[PDB]
Design a protein around this ligand. Structure first.
Ligand SMILES: O=P(O)(O)OC[C@H]1O[C@](O)(COP(=O)(O)O)[C@@H](O)[C@@H]1O
Ligand SMILES: [Mn+2]
Ligand SMILES: [Mn+2]
Ligand SMILES: [Mn+2]
Ligand SMILES: [Mn+2]
Ligand code: NA
Ligand code: NA
Ligand code: NA
Ligand code: NA
Lengths: 507, 498, 506, 505
């Protein structure tokens, strides 16, 4: 009725230009739709307990990230065990699948085993076994022997989240002769940057296969062959696992297209990326990479220091809420929390804060422009799933459908709806517990795991799943009596046959 | 690429025009309907057969001339010609029959000399003209204007007496018998009401209502057609300044509109007609109601076997403006080349359809159509979106009344809208809508409704193959509904032709 | 609320159409030039004065007919008409020579019956012997270039023969499309294969001799056809503008290489609509006008625009539509042939084109047009181009009544016209020829300045701008309180335009 | 010339634009978004302010929440001394504006305890006053203007109490959000005052000390702006008033505020406590949008590079925040604690410079100019007319700059509102206008100091030559560049009507 069009930034939605849309953004216009941008929370000592995990799932965590940079196999087995128990130990219309993503250690370089490194200073960078625990104000040892044969004269070396810098002078036989460009206090075992896949990563990828992880975040992907190395390490048993390539450096930005082509998705890994390229350029790489993923219809994750101050403070800064909103307006499928959930004092509040901001920012999306641009740049398709998806999203915009309900075996039919960014929630009904977890990578897909064995008559089994979609949607607040819904199905069983879109009112 | 596809991809309208290619052949079936007017040149069954094969979709009966008996013969001859093709149900072409009302006509070789004196009289030569409108002598003041014969002659009153209007010939010419008079400076006539009842009793599909000036003119036509005539479509003829200015209230209550350019271009300056034409076409596109462009489109083809460069341009531009239907009057009613004229409108329309800039046109119509909770409208835009995504050869829709097909048509898909119906009247009537190709299905209902649905879809596909719309490997979008009876369309499916 | 301003501020093209208003009166001066063909109906000095008043801007001499002496007389009458009209009101009229070209004609009324046999003969002894079964053509090699099965069109494409055999006597044909055949009718051989004839060269040099402004060059198929015309004009004809007539398939397909070397284009629809299918002509027209608009070169739409006005005092609905749509397509000039050369209403035809063009100009959707022109022209470091676009934008922003430009060659005015300002472009020039020639560009109103140069160049510049203003006011273009944009340059001589100024009229 | 994100500039759609953004495309344009640095202990000394000016600071902010008039007088003199130390090179001198930021309706607490979540705490206004159970505040009428339950926020809104009861003791509350609490902290009462006598004495002090700009705190409606104007007096008529939008009413009444203000500050600190923190980006993008539309300067403020208070490099969210404020359309970006009190005030200015220059190059002009063009009304003002014509000319030829003469700043401001890519080099004899035009994105003021030439046209030309010469010295312009030059037909403000296209020799 009349109150409906005041909500979800609908006045700004029907503006005729982007600028007019911005002018019409309204802080009194409340979000209505379910929050659609998935939240990845990193597990660590602040978030390992089963009862804390349950608080985090209630708060809106959709994907748990296991950081293999730190912790033994046994430690990660216990984190996985806890997430499973939290998820299971909540009615099938209420159940929320949580994905498990393993994030590889990758090609880490660490310094040896506090000292002021002074800006005038003459630092030696040695790679000697012998100086491994001899770190002081003038010697940093590293765990990476080829560093001496790889950064020449001039040539800069970063230490500790890029906070300390060194420029090489001579290469004498004791190590690299540097001077401090940027000085500071240095602790032990800090990360080194120098603006394929290791034996540890392979053992970890195999461990993630043994434990059934849903997604791998692959570190430092530079080229297509890096993704193939991961796929090969996962092996035959790991064919179902999604590979999200982490773009962390210059080469991975430049070879982006070839990387996206062979990946399931992308992470903008802003931590390393902001040291490997100038900090002030990261937002260009982020925007470009999100836009190219949106175009390709493949999930993209924005990561790193999004709500960083909430490690120690219960409220985020103005820059942090902005960064989260802007990641969503950029077009990110997923937003991520690292220290904020792994080790901080406010892990649950950090999740609720990304949820609240993401909901606001999704309602602010200018669909009029975004849909037209997605459409007028996607190529023609003779694939019935794609053709149905675009017809289904169009139909939902025409009637302000509360949802599109899609049956899916692998997630693909839901993924192709998601790529057009409907305002309608995509309620994906599947039998596959793994597909249900994995579809959390796609903005606006709300997975529902259907547990019944098949009706004798296939068409009846289809109807029964669509009803389950409807009943879950109601229970969850997605749908009310009188809503229109778009229902997307196929003409026969099995993956790949989606070809039907139907307009239904909810009774 | 064929069908002007490289011009279709352009990023601006201006780039689109620059890419138009005279070698890019039309591939699509011709989608703008052709209305031909019946008369001595196009009335015999043998001639009408040739008209139908040349592409005539709507036969216009001009009630300005001809007795009822004459029009009954015209209707029967059209039906005999049309029915002669019924023995091949997958090829049969429904033809609508439109009754075009006489209207408020005023009617009068001799020379009218410029500057000479002419008495206009209604009292029961070069210097005196009689007219069948008695009240003319009291409704034209000094020095109001009297146009005569397609507005080619004009007089200006100087005096009013009981012998009638003393005028001066301002624009002179040669005057024959019983020519049209316009007085740009009545109701629904009594003859019109009798003609409307004739129309109902003879099962006409469409009425073209003359000189519609406001909404209550439309209501009087509906009232005259009566309860028996509820299913007849009313197309309002916009013929004068008042009809232009009251256009929105007229279109609101009408099934659609005719740009009646002959009277319009005497009633307003001839140089303003294209403005009225383009505005009314645009508004009718927006409203999703059929619009007809009429009058003098291929005029010289009355006597010449090929048209002038301006007539081919006028036809092409009427299509590019957005017209659902184009019309031929004296070109088929009385000329020497009625079949060649139909063929010529067919050929031009096909070229101009391919030239349509859908990219912008779809975006505009989509952006301006209001949100809708009606599942037929929702499914229509979804299907037309889908058709564009995969370059579908057709959209097959089942329809009882034509509505589901009209709602597809308003978005101007490039795919043909193949409308499968059991209603013979709906199949005739749907020719009002650009790009709808009606198929009349004659089989009694299958025992199981879902089978009955599928058989009609198959019938759509198999008619489409036979008619050259569809080949193996094409994609089509099928639009149906969830239960029997009109108003339940809600389903769109993507199907490959085998 | 005048000049379709409400439809001009629409957000989309379709909304713009929807708001077009027959009550909204044109206020701007009519910008699309009118080219009238000279003939027996329009040759008199009295008649020509009537036509210039009615709006004729360019007189076309049809070299398909009439001797040099006859054309010399036509030229003389146009000049005398123009001169026999007070410098603030003087109207230049260009003279365009339209070449005969590679015309094929029959010999010196009779009927050809569908299905009869007609010999087509090139035997000189048969020239005067045409009848129901015999047509002579002035093209001896026709026998070598139409194979059996090949088609020969006659009389504006109305009659059609198909060759059935070839012998000593000529082409034995069957009448495919019959009709009534007179004398000396045009013949088209669209199936066939074959530059500048000896006649066209004599005609062009006569053009140079009599100071014609513009050549309309027939059947241009390729860039070398334009070079042959420029060469034939020679040393003395360097200043003459060449408008290439696109009249057949090859001229359409080779259009871009033709435009690149031409001063502009004529869409010559008569032959074009025989040489390619009549139903495709509008596609060629709209493409060629669109491409001319993008390149900033003038384009003429021609032939049968108001054909019925040869014998009737008012045009058909199709004809008014065709004139309005040519303007809306982007034509710089529109044209009349038989309607002024031979018809009974030549003054009326000119008045009708003026009336329709003014209405159609006010219906131009400048919002989309200017953006698309802008966003597809390419970057330019030329100061005249940069100033032109700055000046047109400034005109739109304040609904200026005019852009007054000083121009030696016309170029600064042409680069303004290409952005289709709503504002009149009032072009002040000392060059009488440039003043004529710039009628080829839509919306340029040339004023010929006749006073010798002031001692001080800045004062000379300002006096020409004042003359621009006072003429503009006397002619109804400018009112007290109007804004105008004034475009000048930093030093004398062509090529140095670089300054735009915003001025109030008092 | 595929530098400055030029290949992304050529894209047909905004989405294609993002896709073509290239980390290898170097900015070439001078940085156009002005940087406001707050003065305080870390950035107050003459030698430090010289480094700040060299790093890019364009406007020094005096924060009147803290410090005596003596303090601020010294801050003003120090800035002038640092700025005038570069005056002996008039072809390179950088004018620096001084903005006085008012205290406003500040509530502070008493004179480091910790407030336990769910414990009871009395808020008191009894003169004879704290600790874990008692917080004193300097706003007597608080006890009267917060009903049960109603929320009290303390310390950048990190602590919150909910009132259960009102007694003569004051407000007995329960700690809703607990936290560690120190001396004299900011208090906010969302949904509860006038311009204060302190603020009036402060405005008069700013007038007497020639400040360029006032940032007026908590503007809630048009009459709040009239009150500032009245308090500046006749002597302060040329000071620019920048309204700070800091609460819900200010957002809702934004239009009547903008109408009477010289421009706007998105004062994110208070705004993000007064309305839900998650809604601030909506108010930010709306207010910037509307200020772009109106052609009036807008400032994004607060916590933009917060962590640089203590770290030499910012977080990934801070650099994104700066870049996005520029992309949103901000004329100026601000540093507060980062320069007033942090350990890296010069690095923080350098970082905002570096990020702004990148973000400026990524602006999608093709869309933004079209939108700004199509939405600006028709105008018969020759200055407006000439401005849009100069900006379209500058795009046609990728002009290196537009050089404009201006007395008040206005002709430069009307070029800046179309967001040219060309730098707007504004030559003026007015030292205050030269300072003030830093409020407008992409205006580089040049202060001209020579007496007028006898012949005015010569004087005009000489100032244009000086625009060029500074442009060349400063790296804006090279031999062969094209420039658009905007001048007027007579002396005195308001007659700009001429645009010329010139080659640089
Ligand atoms: O931007 P403002 O304040 O209107 O100033 C523009 C003024 O500057 C000038 O270019 C020079 O004026 P002065 O010679 O008075 O400085 C004028 O022609 C013009 O009106
Ligand atoms: Mn990393
Ligand atoms: Mn009529
Ligand atoms: Mn010709
Ligand atoms: Mn504040
Ligand atoms: Na990791
Ligand atoms: Na009739
Ligand atoms: Na000729
Ligand atoms: Na302050």
């Amino acid at each position: 009725g009349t109150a409906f069009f005041q909500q979800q930034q609908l006045p700004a939605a029907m503006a005729d230009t982007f600028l007019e849309h911005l002018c019409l953004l309204d802080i009194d216009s409340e979000p209505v739709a379910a929050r659609s941008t998935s939240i990845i929370a990193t597990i660590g000592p602040a978030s390992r307990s089963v009862e804390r995990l349950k608080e985090m799932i209630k708060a809106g965590m959709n994907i748990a990230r296991l950081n293999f940079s730190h912790g033994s196999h046994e430690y990660h087995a216990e984190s996985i065990a806890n997430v499973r128990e939290a998820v299971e130990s909540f009615s099938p219309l209420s159940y929320r699948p949580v994905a498990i993503a393993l994030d590889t250690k990758g090609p880490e370089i660490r310094t040896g085993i506090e000292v002021e490194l002074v800006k005038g200073s003459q630092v030696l960078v040695t790679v000697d076994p012998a100086f491994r625990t001899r770190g002081n104000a003038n010697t940093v040892w590293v765990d990476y022997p080829n560093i001496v044969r790889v950064v020449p004269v001039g040539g800069r070396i970063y230490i500790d989240d890029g906070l300390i810098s060194l420029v090489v002078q001579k290469i004498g036989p004791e190590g690299l002769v540097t001077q401090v460009e940027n000085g500071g206090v240095l602790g032990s075992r800090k990360g080194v940057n120098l603006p394929g896949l290791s034996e540890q990563d392979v053992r970890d990828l195999r461990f993630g296969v043994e434990h059934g992880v849903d997604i791998v975040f692959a570190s430092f992907v530079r080229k297509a062959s890096d993704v193939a190395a991961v796929r090969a390490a996962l092996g035959p048993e790991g064919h179902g696992i999604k590979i999200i390539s982490k773009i962390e450096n210059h080469e991975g930005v430049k070879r982006f297209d070839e990387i996206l082509e062979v990946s399931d998705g992308i992470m903008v890994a802003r931590g390393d990326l902001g040291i490997e390229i100038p900090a002030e350029k990261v937002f260009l790489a982020q925007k470009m990479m999100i836009g190219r993923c949106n175009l390709a219809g493949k999930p993209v994750v924005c990561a790193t220091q999004m709500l960083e101050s909430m490690i120690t403070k219960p409220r985020p800064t103005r820059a942090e809420t902005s960064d989260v909103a802007n990641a969503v307006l950029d077009g990110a499928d997923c937003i991520m929390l690292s220290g904020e959930t792994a080790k901080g004092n406010f892990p649950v509040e950090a999740v609720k804060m990304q949820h609240a901001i993401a909901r606001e920012a999704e309602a602010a999306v200018y669909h009029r422009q975004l849909f037209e641009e997605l459409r007028r740049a996607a190529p023609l398709s003779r694939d019935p799933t794609e053709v149905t998806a675009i017809g289904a999203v169009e139909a939902a915009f025409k009637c302000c459908a509360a949802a599109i309900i899609v049956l899916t075996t692998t997630g693909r039919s839901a993924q192709l709806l998601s790529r057009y960014r409907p305002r309608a929630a995509v309620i994906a009904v599947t039998r596959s517990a793994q597909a249900a977890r994995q579809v959390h990578l796609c903005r606006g897909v709300f997975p529902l795991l259907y547990r019944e064995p098949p009706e004798a008559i296939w068409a009846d089994d289809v109807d029964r799943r669509v009803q389950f979609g409807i009943e879950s949607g109601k229970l969850r607040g997605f749908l009310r009596v009188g809503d229109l819904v778009i229902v997307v199905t196929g003409w026969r069983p099995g993956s790949g046959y989606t070809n039907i879109m139907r307009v239904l009112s909810i009774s």
